[PDB]
Amino acid sequence: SELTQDPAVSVALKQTVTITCRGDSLRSHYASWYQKKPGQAPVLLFYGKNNRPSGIPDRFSGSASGNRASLTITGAQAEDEADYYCSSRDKSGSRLSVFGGGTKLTVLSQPKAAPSVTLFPPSSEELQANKATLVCLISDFYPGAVTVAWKADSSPVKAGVETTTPSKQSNNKYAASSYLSLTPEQWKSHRSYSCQVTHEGSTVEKTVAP
Amino acid sequence: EVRLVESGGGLVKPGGSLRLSCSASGFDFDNAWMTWVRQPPGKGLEWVGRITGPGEGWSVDYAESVKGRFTISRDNTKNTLYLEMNNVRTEDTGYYFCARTGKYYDFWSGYAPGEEYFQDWGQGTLVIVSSASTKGPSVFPLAPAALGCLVKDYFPEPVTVSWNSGALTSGVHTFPAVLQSSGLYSLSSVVTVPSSSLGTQTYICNVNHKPSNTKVDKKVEPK
């Protein structure tokens, strides 16, 4: 990741938010910004020094200084809630292009809520079939932006982790699910398995054991 | 006025080959630079590669995770952009886009390559990379409050999950499917439970998979 952005930033309605993109190449190059809604095509918002393409509202504006590139939305609206990416060179002088991590912008429509985490151990039916799967269900959180990490005893797990994107429930709140695939031997062995759910700078953890 | 139409996406096995096409209209395609950009499911955009025009000697640049496997060519007589995917891997899954790229250089403050900005994008075509033959789901109960059924290893999509044959509709949520490294979709659905009465009322999930003609019913009971 040569260009780094914050994963998710919330903004109140009719307020100003700044999304920051950082990288080494930004010291020698400008950056272009893009708005990406789920399913819809990405739209170019800002590029160069002070260039805004026609059609884009004037409330969008860009800036850069040092190794940082900033996109400013003055007076955010409901339709501005989408993903935002920066794009520039990966290295100073390189002929290649690279994108930023992405910033999930959320416009506050519902009172912010903390997640409810449930962790399920592998069923005895699944262990009989030479399989094992941990299910970590998360729901009733706002905004819809969480980061899930798995712990084997006290050691993080990277292999076999599958986590879905958050989706709105029927009660205007979001829900996300995560999975972790182990062997029956890796399950019965471990003292404890933990699902650490981090949301808005705070982490909720649930633990299961054989 | 500018339009970009991608086509050619679909199911491909790992190591196989597939060709994507992007037709263009509304601008001068002969001198415009083109770029492929892909987005994996649930992840961010990724620059794939860029092919220049005849002024720059038809030069093509590729991403480091893409060199040696994908080939980008263009046909100015037909206003089409190509992306030949070869030795495809399971990591290449996602929506592929073509974009009309602009070229920018600020004179007073500027650098040697020239900052490139992608002006107009296409809608994108989906390329699923799985090795997996059609396979019915395996449903494992999740004991309690919260009650769930784990649909696992099902291909292709979709699976319809219903609880208590349509009687259960309070608090039910059916998550989005996830394509595993194996190439088989997996999915779960959870129901919030009164947390007081569990013995009196049964809780059965009804999993339906039309591609494999498999209907599964699993009783979920507490430990």
Author numbering:
A (entry chain L): 2 to 9, 11 to 95, 95A, 95B, 95C, 96 to 209
B (entry chain H): 1 to 52, 52A, 52B, 52C, 53 to 82, 82A, 82B, 82C, ...
Pull text from the paper:
We tested the influence of the di-proline motif in the CDR H3 of 10E8v4 on its SEC and HIC profiles by mutating prolines at positions 100f or 100g to alanine. Compared to the SEC of 10E8v4, mutating either of these prolines resulted in the three-peak profile of 10E8 merging into a predominantly single peak, suggesting that the prolines cause the SEC anomaly. To define the structural basis for the anomalous SEC and HIC behavior, we determined the crystal structures of 10E8v4 with Pro100f to Ala (10E8v4-100fA) in two different space groups, Pro100g to Ala (10E8v4-100gA) and Pro100f and Pro100g to Ala (10E8v4-100fgAA) variant at 3.7 Å, 2.4 Å, 2 Å and 2.7 Å resolutions, respectively. After rigid body refinement, the CDR H3s (95TGKYYDFWFGYPPGEE YFQD102) of the variants were defined clearly in their Fo-Fc maps contoured at 3σ. Extensive hydrogen bonding networks were observed between the CDR H3 and the CDR L1 of 10E8v4, involving heavy chain residues, Tyr98, Ser100c, Pro100g, Gly100h and Glu100i, and light chain residues Ser30, Tyr32, Lys51 and Arg91. However, these hydrogen bonds were not retained in the Pro to Ala variants, suggesting the YPP motif to be critical for coordinating these hydrogen bonds, and disruption of these hydrogen-bonding interactions correlated with the degree that the CDR H3 conformations differed from that of wild type, their reduced binding affinities, and their reduced neutralization potencies. Crystal structures of P100fA, P100gA, P100fgAA and H31LCF variants all showed “open” CDR H3 conformations, which correlated with reduced affinity to gp41, reduced neutralizing potency against select viruses, and reduced affinity to the column matrix. Part of the data presented here favors the Masiero et al. proposal, as we found the P100gA mutation to reduce affinity to gp41 and neutralization potency substantially and the P100fA variant to retain reasonable neutralization potency against viruses tested.
Antibody 10E8 is one of the broadest monoclonal antibodies thus far identified that effectively neutralizes diverse strains of HIV-1. It targets the membrane-proximal external region (MPER) of the HIV-1 viral spike with a highly hydrophobic antigen-binding region. Here we show cis-trans conformational isomerization of the Tyr-Pro-Pro (YPP) motif in the heavy chain 3rd complementarity-determining region (CDR H3) of antibody 10E8 to be the mechanistic basis of its multipeak behavior. Overall, our results show how a conformationally dynamic cis-proline and the interaction between the CDR H3 and the CDR L1 of 10E8 appear to provide exactly the requisite degree of structural plasticity needed for a highly hydrophobic surface to recognize an MPER epitope.
